[PDB]
Design a protein around this ligand. Structure first.
Ligand SMILES: CCCCCCCCCCCCCCCCCC(=O)OC[C@H](COP(=O)([O-])OCC(O)COP(=O)([O-])OC[C@@H](COC(=O)CCCCCCCCCCCCCCCCC)OC(=O)CCCCCCCCCCCCCCCCC)OC(=O)CCCCCCCCCCCCCCCCC
Ligand SMILES: CCCCCCCCCCCCCCCCCC(=O)OC[C@H](COP(=O)([O-])OCC[N+](C)(C)C)OC(=O)CCCCCCCCCCCCCCCCC
Ligand SMILES: CCCCCCCCCCCCCCCCCC(=O)OC[C@H](COP(=O)(O)OCCN)OC(=O)CCCCCCCCCCCCCCCCC
Ligand SMILES: CCCCCCCCCCCCCCCCCC(=O)OC[C@H](COP(=O)(O)OCCN)OC(=O)CCCCCCCCCCCCCCCCC
Ligand SMILES: CCCCCCCCCCCCCCCCCC(=O)OC[C@H](COP(=O)(O)OCCN)OC(=O)CCCCCCCCCCCCCCCCC
Ligand SMILES: CCCCCCCCCCCCCCCCCC(=O)O[C@@H](COC(=O)CCCCCCCCCCCCCCC)COP(=O)(O)OC[C@H](O)CO
Ligand SMILES: Nc1nc2c(ncn2[C@@H]2O[C@H](COP(=O)(O)OP(=O)(O)OP(=O)(O)O)[C@@H](O)[C@H]2O)c(=O)[nH]1
Lengths: 63, 99, 347, 57, 120, 26, 320, 459, 139
């Protein structure tokens, strides 16, 4: 076929690879960033829910 | 006798059975056909037309297009009198070299 | 042992491991470990040979010691925090204490000394259960508490696991001892990545599991426990020895076979974590596993060892086992590399 | 002419050819996803023909 | 890591909101490879049992392809979900944290001083 | 024919350990 | 179905079927002592399953048609050849004995399998516990090398340990000259040339080792030639025991289920017979073994698993 | 792209489901057909590589090797159907399966667009070759030879794995186009040297240079005929392909770090060619000759000069085709004499007149006699090396001097001279062997007319 | 790692006596650890040779630790090149020679010079560049 097919198709190949390449670099940075700070959706290590607290009055006033 | 084994078999001569043996296998008729396959799809199909294919392949590496641009470029270049081909490639006028 | 009794004993063993993986309370975690131990001993004692009694006794002593050691890790964490929940614990000594406690159950460090010997004493089927299912429970705790682990402490355990586990494999004749040594080597590979990202610790778990079944119940199919005995199997069923060799290289980690997928992914993670010296040594020691791996392949199918005239009977008869799930076990354990990006499902 | 048997011993001769026929198909299918900059690079971008709509298939 | 994100209901193989993604198309190259795996188990299944491999129990290997394909299909949707989820909340974070992602300056190669090493 | 292992090769892989010593001799 | 664990769970026991007519009585004696004859009346007079003496092609008899396969394809040994040159260099003597031990070991399982699945006793000639007497005798005149002995009983303890010893064994006592009279009448030229020592060497290995050592795990009753032909008297004697000695009269359905697991698995019963210890008489090199196995495979019926050979006429292979 | 891959893998069921005796025929039919299709791939554009998809692409370097591998595929089948005739059909089918599975991996590797994808089947080629060397090898030391070949490359390949993933986590994608366009000057920090060492030693092992070459003599000698050619005619070139792709991100570190490898290579070729001068085994002599020619390529690639690259590919194809022919030569007389000692069967020309001719032109091609492509490859490297430094011609030319002696040494010892009296089994050469020989030599002279086809991307 | 900190705190090629003391302490501690293991896994049938065994192992390890301590420090002192990895390389081979002397075998000593003579360069390479063997969880 014409060189145009190879030229345009290779440009699409480059565009896909460039977008993928920059995303992986963003992946490493974000994963490092939100692992440390933690104000992000993943890496949220489990805690204990406040629902499992008995708020009813106890047998002793000081509680 | 160490182990119950077999003696080393004697190398059969393909020629002594069928003097027209072609060394491709034992059975004659397929041997003759094996001749036809290897030479046909070997020398004939691949070597002959394959050579013509690669010999008559279209412009590879733009070897002749680069030439055709050369003479029109050089004829233009000495027509004006300016140097035949500049020592610089990326025009320095738009280059913004630091300091 | 009565099959109904045998079924129940296995039924509790899997539930005990199941109980460990589903318990949010440290006390229950111990409950699953101990009742798993409580029913593991009789399975090893099913054959009831003096070697099995020695094997079972050794296994109980080390596992009981680790479980009792595991309590102070719970109790000390209780003492300093008053939390039975299984999360990031709040004491370096408690963290350090359980790390040895769980490691002895897995057998990575010198703790590993029980792993080969117990497998040798007991039957092939029992060894299959011990080397595959009995590794889910100790790993499950480490996955949950991975955030609290001291990186230096656990990585050192992983290196010596693959170092000794790989190194002693060169000097083993009885196929059971090779499998245990390979298991120790694979133990370190997953635990090395465990502090960094738990996802491929699981990925290494299922993959390493898939070979270990494919290996053992091929060996059970062969009914062979010695390299020479395995060598004779080419005469009876050469096809089995052929599939024997495919898994042997897959277990070695040669591409494009399945076993390369774990190691490759493990190297990638620590390289992301800037640890680049650490993966390199483990890759270099990976060839140590491949050597005795290759030796069995040389003895099994690649060459053709001499046989015995009494093998002629085995030709006449046929195998009665049903080798359940065997056809899909090897295929899932030899060519799954192209489906690698499916590891995100574990996440 | 033995046709019931000649196909049995010579049906293997068709797999590789249709493989090449199949091979062009994925070759001419995958490129469609790679369209993207079709007639978009300024080196080759040019006015469309009155009837043709796709410069390079 | 997708271990404790808000909303993860446990033991849910395919959460409902994952249905908002393009489902894998029935002849997906990954999927047909999963089907190839089911077949490949079939041939060797007759091999261990010493049966005429390819022409041996057409029902046995037929089930294998069907079983692998179906389990392969859901495994693909879950796989597509995790990657989509990983990219989704990724983008939501980078908008939420503009300061940690500065836009690097736009300079062409004309002004960039990249030293040149001759090969001699 | 191609070389195939014999009792020499078999006994090489046979025994307690392929890498024996005085300690492992017994 | 078989005795698979589902069958035992659903209720298939073993103690239900077995009755008073469930014994492993063996008819044993000297060479050409008429034991094969004496085994028959015991079989017919007791309604008790008979098993003829296990030959070289006994394993062939069990499988397929049961036609004796080729010696090259099954046995690599000929008893008549052993007569001609007992100390032949090819190791025919030990190859004969080792193959014979395997065939009777298979015969022992077939006897146990039938009895444990039907409750009917089994009578067989020269149980595997008495097979050593030939090897000991064959070792007396050096018909086999010294290294054959430890291999033989190595297979014995790794196999015969599990197989328990019979209920009651009957012995046909025959003096050496009497055999030295009979084998003349048989006429087959290969069985003229057994030395009196060999008939003697089997004789004392019987008296001083076979009968007394295993007499404590089952009752032993001797019969001479006159007492041998008295089928009425001997059968009455066999019924007149309570079978005290022996590991038979104490186990429960647990062991029988486990025993039928091993015995039913025809690969497992003699899995240890192909022991990996190498000796010249029994070891066959790779080239010979590979060629013979290929010769075995190309035979009809054995190309695939039973019920999977289209050549013999196994229809519906694409559905089975 | 897929027009070559699917027909190759689709060939596998054909061999497995073909008739009992037609396996050699039908495999040979389409293996030649695949080469014809691959020959169509040999066309290349001006400067942009012929790109197919994210998964596969080809340039002026991959295509000549691609057509070489597919062209090779019939030749092992031709050269193997003599020592495997007396084998069971399944083992023959299993053997044929190994080559085409191997040949599939080579096609995938050369066409790979991502370094990791290049890497995965870079190691995958060993699994079939290890089987071929060990199982069907006809010797005793093949077991140790297989171990040596396997462990040497693995010991070099695994550090590459850690290196490659490091590039991935530092510079994003490792696609060959993106890595070439976004190349950055590698620093001289003491870590970058070990970065450089890991990215290079992997290809160094399976491109035998002095010291790291002891696997080749045992592998080549002990392997069967088909295993010997594939491991010597394409496999050694896998290292060569790796460098041209991977030194894109190794400059200017390659300028300084090249010295220890250059010194080991230039001196190594003189030493290795000297070994050829006094070799007792014909196959070993051919094997060591492969070390010398490959060591010449090592200098060529490591110089990083346009002329050096062009001659590197030229020698790359020429040496592989020639070494394959010579291994056929050694194989063709081996079973007649059933030994590998060179002096055992002397004066073969008197008994076999055509083999004298075939062995003659095989020697001239290995001689780098002009205008054979070997000469174009070697002569191009000489000029590139000479521009790099004037002294190297002393080493460079002396190799050609030593190459003349040992190449003709096999000719005089075997072909010429007095026939040995005791042997009487030497039959007239089968037309298959003669045809296979012309199958090798004829395309070599055909390539003489069009060197531009095999010059490479630098052209 | 306070005992290890002693070696790092002292500047390279300075206060050689302190560096030797710091280095030999590392060797002595390492020799003590391996000797205790060897006593454990391998039973020292009689106690008198048991202390003899740990005496040998500690003496060797301390000797390698000490000799590496001087050779590394004095070479940096003599050549005034502290950053140079070769300073450890000769020191690494120097320890190898001592091990050969303790085992009385040239081959073992020569192989010892090659192996952890190299690693001596590597560990110094890591200190200069910043290589971390037990990397903390970063991503
Ligand atoms: C992830 C991807 C990979 C994994 C995918 C998941 C499948 C994994 C397992 C594959 C198959 C393994 C197998 O069977 O190999 C053959 C291998 C040998 O089989 P064999 O030659 O028949 O010998 C087995 C006995 O020795 C024979 O002894 P027997 O003659 O007494 O017969 C006993 C047998 C016969 O069957 C029975 O007796 C059935 C039960 C009847 C009585 C009870 C009825 C009421 C309860 C029913 C419960 C169901 O029953 C059992 O063995 C009991 C266990 C199985 C049923 C219970 C399951 C748990 C509940 O199996 C075993 O040795 C069993 C080990 C225990 C189960 C597998 C553990 C290994 C895998 C762990 C990891 C799994 C993935 C985790 C993630
Ligand atoms: C006008 C045309 C006149 C007729 C021309 C006929 C062809 C000819 O001679 O052309 C001369 C031309 C000369 O070019 P030219 O510049 O003189 O122009 C031609 C026209 N005339 C002569 C009139 C000026 O050269 C070629 O065409 C090159 C031929 C190269 C052939 C290569 C064959 C390779 C075969 C490989 C087989 C194996 C493949 C697999 C292995 C690969 C390697 C690993
Ligand atoms: C990744 C790299 C490669 C990894 C794998 C490598 C494997 C081999 C490596 C070497 C192994 C050791 C050396 C050789 C050992 C041989 C083992 C053996 O048992 O060999 C003999 C045996 C005899 O064959 P037999 O069992 O009788 O079965 C014949 C077929 N019925 O042979 C057999 O039992 C083999 C039987 C094979 C049957 C193959 C059937 C193929 C069917 C293909 C169908 C294709 C359909 C295409 C459809 C296209 C359109 C959709
Ligand atoms: C982490 C600790 C790992 C401990 C592993 C212990 C078992 C394997 C090592 C072993 O048995 O000995 C190694 C070492 C030296 O043993 P050696 O005194 O040379 O005697 C060998 C011949 N009996 O003896 C040892 O005990 C040293 C082991 C730790 C070395 C650091
Ligand atoms: C920059 C700071 C540091 C500066 C100082 C330099 C480093 C510390 C000193 C050198 C340490 C490494 C050299 C070896 C020390 C141990 C030697 C030893 O144990 O020798 C005894 C023995 C060898 O002899 P054997 O094989 O038993 O034969 C005789 C049998 N009767 O041993 C054996 O048999 C077992 C095998 C040897 C012992 C196991 C391996 C020991 C070394 C591990 C790495 C240590 C790294 C230390 C530095 C970093 C950490 C602080
Ligand atoms: C059989 C032995 C090997 C054979 C020869 C192989 C080649 C020799 C060199 C082997 C190197 C293997 C490790 C290389 C991995 C990739 C290296 C890379 O990409 O470069 C890094 C180089 O970093 C390293 O430290 C790489 C490892 C250096 C060498 C130490 C380990 C390798 C040698 C020992 C293991 C292998 C030897 C065999 C052991 C049995 C860059 O990271 P950095 O240190 O610059 O990181 C940023 C910052 O400076 C701090 O991190
Ligand atoms: N080595 C060996 N030889 C056996 C065995 N059983 C039978 N033979 C031989 O078989 C041959 C004939 O069997 P015999 O039982 O002695 O005689 P027979 O003519 O069959 O008559 P019966 O004694 O009534 O069965 C003799 O050479 C025996 O030694 C055995 O278990 N081992």
């Amino acid at each position: 076929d014409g060189p145009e097919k190879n030229y345009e198709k290779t440009m699409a190949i480059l565009q896909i690879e460039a977008e993928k390449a920059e995303l992986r670099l963003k992946e490493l940075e974000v994963r490092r960033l939100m692992r440390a700070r933690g104000d992000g959706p993943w890496y949220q290590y489990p805690t204990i829910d406040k629902a499992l607290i008995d708020h009813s009055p106890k047998t002793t006033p000081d509680n | 006798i160490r182990l119950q084994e077999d003696p080393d078999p004697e190398d059969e001569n393909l020629y002594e059975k069928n003097p027209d043996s072609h060394g491709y296998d034992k059975d004659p008729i397929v041997d003759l056909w094996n001749m036809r396959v290897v030479f046909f799809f070997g020398f004939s199909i691949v070597l002959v037309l394959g050579s013509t294919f690669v010999a008559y392949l279209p412009d590879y590496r733009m070897q002749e297009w680069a030439r055709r641009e050369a003479e029109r470029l050089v004829k233009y270049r000495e027509a004006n009198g300016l140097p035949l081909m500049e020592s610089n490639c990326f025009d320095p006028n738009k280059i913004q070299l630091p300091e | 042992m009565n099959p109904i009794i045998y079924t129940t004993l296995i039924m509790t063993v899997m539930s005990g491991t199941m109980l460990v993986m589903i318990s949010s309370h440290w006390l229950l975690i111990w409950i699953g470990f101990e009742m798993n131990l409580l029913a593991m001993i009789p399975v090893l004692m099913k054959n009831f040979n003096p070697r099995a009694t020695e094997a079972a006794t050794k296994y109980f002593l080390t596992q009981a010691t680790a479980s009792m050691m595991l309590m102070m890790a719970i109790i000390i964490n209780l003492l300093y925090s008053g939390q039975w929940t299984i999360t990031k614990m709040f004491n370096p000594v408690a963290m350090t204490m359980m790390t040895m406690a769980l490691a002895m159950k897995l057998g990575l460090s010198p703790f590993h000394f029980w792993v080969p010997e117990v497998t040798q004493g007991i039957s092939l089927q029992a060894g299959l259960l011990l080397l595959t299912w009995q590794k889910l429970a100790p790993l499950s705790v480490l996955c949950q508490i991975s955030q609290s682990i001291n990186p230096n402490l656990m990585l050192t355990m992983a290196m010596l696991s693959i170092l000794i586990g790989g190194w002693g494999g060169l000097n083993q004749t009885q196929l059971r001892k090779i499998m245990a040594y390979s298991s120790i080597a694979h133990m370190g590979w997953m635990t090395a990545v465990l502090p960094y990202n738990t996802t491929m610790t699981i990925l290494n778990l299922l993959i390493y599991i898939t070979m270990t079944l494919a290996m053992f119940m091929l060996l059970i199919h062969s009914s062979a426990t010695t390299t020479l005995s395995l060598s004779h199997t080419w005469n009876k069923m050469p096809v089995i020895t052929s599939l024997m060799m495919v898994t042997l290289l897959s277990m070695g980690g040669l591409p494009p076979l399945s076993g390369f997928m774990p190691k490759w992914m493990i190297i990638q993670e620590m390289t992301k974590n800037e640890s680049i010296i650490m993966p390199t040594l483990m890759a270099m020691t990976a060839l140590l596993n491949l050597y005795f791996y290759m030796r069995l392949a040389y003895s099994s199918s690649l060459t053709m060892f001499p046989s015995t005239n009494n093998m002629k009977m085995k030709w006449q008869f046929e195998h009665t086992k049903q080798m359940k799930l065997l056809p899909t076990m090897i295929v899932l354990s030899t060519l799954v590399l192209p489906m690698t990006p499916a590891l995100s499902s574990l996440n | 002419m033995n046709v019931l048997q000649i196909v049995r011993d010579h049906w293997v001769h068709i797999l590789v050819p249709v493989g090449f026929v199949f091979g062009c198909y994925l070759d001419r299918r995958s490129d469609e996803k790679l369209t993207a900059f079709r007639n978009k690079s300024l080196l080759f971008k040019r006015e469309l023909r009155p009837n043709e709509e796709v410069t390079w298939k | 890591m997708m271990s404790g994100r808000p909303g993860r209901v446990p033991l849910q193989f395919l959460p409902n909101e994952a249905r908002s993604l393009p489902p894998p198309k029935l002849t997906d190259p990954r999927l047909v490879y999963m089907g190839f795996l089911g077949y490949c188990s079939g041939l060797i299944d007759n091999a261990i049992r010493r049966r005429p491999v390819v022409s041996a129990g057409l029902h046995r290997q037929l089930l294998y392809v069907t079983s692998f394909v179906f389990f392969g299909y859901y495994l693909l949707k879950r796989q597509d979900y995790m990657y989509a989820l990983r990219d989704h909340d990724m983008f939501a974070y980078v908008k939420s944290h503009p300061e940690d992602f500065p836009e690097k300056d736009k300079k062409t190669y004309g002004e960039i001083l990249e030293e040149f090493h001759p090969v001699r | 024919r191609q070389w195939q292992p014999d009792v020499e090769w078999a006994e090489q892989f046979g025994g307690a350990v392929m890498y024996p010593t005085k300690e492992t001799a017994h | 179905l078989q005795y698979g664990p589902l069958a035992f769970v659903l209720g298939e026991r073993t103690t239900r079927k077995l009755t008073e007519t469930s014994k492993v009585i063996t008819v044993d004696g000297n060479i050409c002592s008429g034991k094969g004859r004496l085994a028959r009346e015991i079989a017919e007079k007791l309604g008790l399953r008979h098993f003829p003496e296990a030959g070289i092609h006994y394993a062939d008899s069990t499988t397929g048609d049961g036609k004796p396969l080729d010696v090259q394809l099954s046995g690599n040994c000929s008893l008549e050849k052993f007569y001609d040159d007992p100390k032949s260099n090819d190791g025919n003597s030990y190859r004969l004995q080792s193959w014979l031990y395997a065939s009777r070991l298979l015969q022992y399982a077939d006897a146990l399998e039938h009895l444990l699945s039907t409750g009917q006793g089994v009578v067989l000639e020269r149980s595997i516990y008495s097979d050593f007497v030939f090897l000991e005798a064959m070792y007396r005149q050096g018909f086999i090398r010294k290294q054959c002995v430890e291999h033989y009983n190595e297979v014995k303890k790794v196999t015969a340990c599990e197989y328990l010893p019979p209920h009651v064994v009957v012995y046909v006592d025959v003096p050496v000259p009497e055999i030295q009279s009979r084998i003349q009448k048989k006429g087959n030229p290969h069985e003229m040339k057994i030395t009196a020592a060999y008939l003697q060497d089997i004789e004392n290995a019987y008296k001083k080792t076979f009968l007394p050592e295993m007499s404590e795990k089952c009752e032993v009753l001797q019969y001479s030639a006159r007492e041998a032909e008295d089928a009425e008297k001997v059968v009455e004697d066999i019924e007149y025991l309570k079978c005290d000695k022996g590991p038979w009269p104490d186990q429960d359905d647990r062991t029988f289920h486990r025993l039928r697991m091993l015995v039913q698995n025809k690969l497992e019963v003699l899995n240890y017979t192909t022991i990996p210890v190498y000796l010249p008489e029994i070891t066959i090199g790779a080239h010979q073994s590979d060629r013979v196995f290929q010769k075995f495979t190309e035979l009809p019926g054995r190309k695939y698993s039973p019920g999977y050979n289209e050549d013999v006429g196994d229809k519906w292979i694409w559905l089975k | 792209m897929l027009k070559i891959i699917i027909p190759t893998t689709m060939l596998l069921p054909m061999t497995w489901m073909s008739k009992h005796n037609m396996i050699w025929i039908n495999a040979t039919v389409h293996s030649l057909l695949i080469s014809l299709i691959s020959l169509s791939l040999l066309n290349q554009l001006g400067e942009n590589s012929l790109n197919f998809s994210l998964t596969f692409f080809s340039d002026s370097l991959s295509a000549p090797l691609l057509v070489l591998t597919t062209w090779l595929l019939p030749l092992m089948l031709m050269a193997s159907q003599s020592h495997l005739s007396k084998e069971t059909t399944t083992r023959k089918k299993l053997y044929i399966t190994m080559l085409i599975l191997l040949q599939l991996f080579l096609i995938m590797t050369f066409t790979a667009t991502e370094l990791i994808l290049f890497y995965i089947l870079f190691e995958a080629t060993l699994v079939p070759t290890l089987i071929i060397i060990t199982r069907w090898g006809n010797q005793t030391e093949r077991l140790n030879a297989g171990l040596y070949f396997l462990f040497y490359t693995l010991a070099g390949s695994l550090p590459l794995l850690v290196a490659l993933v490091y590039i991935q986590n530092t510079t994003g994608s490792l696609n060959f186009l993106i890595i070439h366009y976004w190349s950055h000057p590698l620093s001289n920090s003491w870590s970058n040297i070990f970065m450089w060492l890991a990215c290079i030693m992997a290809f160094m092992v399976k491109m035998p240079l002095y010291g790291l070459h002891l696997w080749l003599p045992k592998a080549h000698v002990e392997a069967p005929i088909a295993g010997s050619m594939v491991l010597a005619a394409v496999l050694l070139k896998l290292g060569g392909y790796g460098m041209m792709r991977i030194t894109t991100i190794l400059n200017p570190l390659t300028n300084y770090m090249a010295y220890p490898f250059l010194m080991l290579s230039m001196w190594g070729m003189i030493m290795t060619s000297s070994i050829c001068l006094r070799q007792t085994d014909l196959k070993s002599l051919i094997a060591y000759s492969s070390v010398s020619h490959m060591a010449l390529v090592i200098v060529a690639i490591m110089i990083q000069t346009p002329w050096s690259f062009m001659g590197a590919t030229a020698l790359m194809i020429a040496h592989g085709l020639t070494s394959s022919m010579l291994f056929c030569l050694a194989n063709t007389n081996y079973e007649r004499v059933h030994s590998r000692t060179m002096i055992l069967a002397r004066g073969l020309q008197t008994l076999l007149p055509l083999m004298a001719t075939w062995w003659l032109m095989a020697s001239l091609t290995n001689l780098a006699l002009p205008p054979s492509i070997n000469l174009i490859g070697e002569l191009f490297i000489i000029t590139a090396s000479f521009s790099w430094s004037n002294i190297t011609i002393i080493l460079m030319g002396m190799n050609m001097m030593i190459t003349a002696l040992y190449s003709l040494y096999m000719l005089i010892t075997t072909q010429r001279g007095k026939y040995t009296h005791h042997i009487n089994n030497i039959k007239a050469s089968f037309t298959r062997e003669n045809a296979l020989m012309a199958l090798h030599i004829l395309p070599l002279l055909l390539l003489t007319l069009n060197p531009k086809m095999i010059l490479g991307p630098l052209y | 790692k306070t005992l290890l900190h002693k070696y790092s705190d002292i500047p390279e090629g300075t206060e050689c006596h302190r560096k030797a003391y710091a280095s030999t302490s590392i060797g002595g501690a390492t020799g003590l650890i391996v000797s205790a293991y060897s006593i454990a896994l391998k039973p020292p049938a009689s106690f008198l040779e048991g202390v003899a065994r740990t005496g040998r192992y500690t003496f060797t390890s301390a000797a390698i630790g000490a000799i590496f301590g001087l050779t590394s420090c004095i070479s940096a002192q003599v050549r005034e090149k502290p950053d140079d990895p070769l300073n450890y390389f000769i020191g690494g081979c120097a320890g190898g020679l001592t091990l050969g002397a303790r085992t009385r075998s040239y081959g073992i000593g020569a192989a010892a010079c090659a192996y952890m003579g190299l690693t001596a360069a590597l560990v110094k390479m890591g200190q200069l560049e910043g290589w971390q063997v037990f990397a903390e969880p970063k991503v």
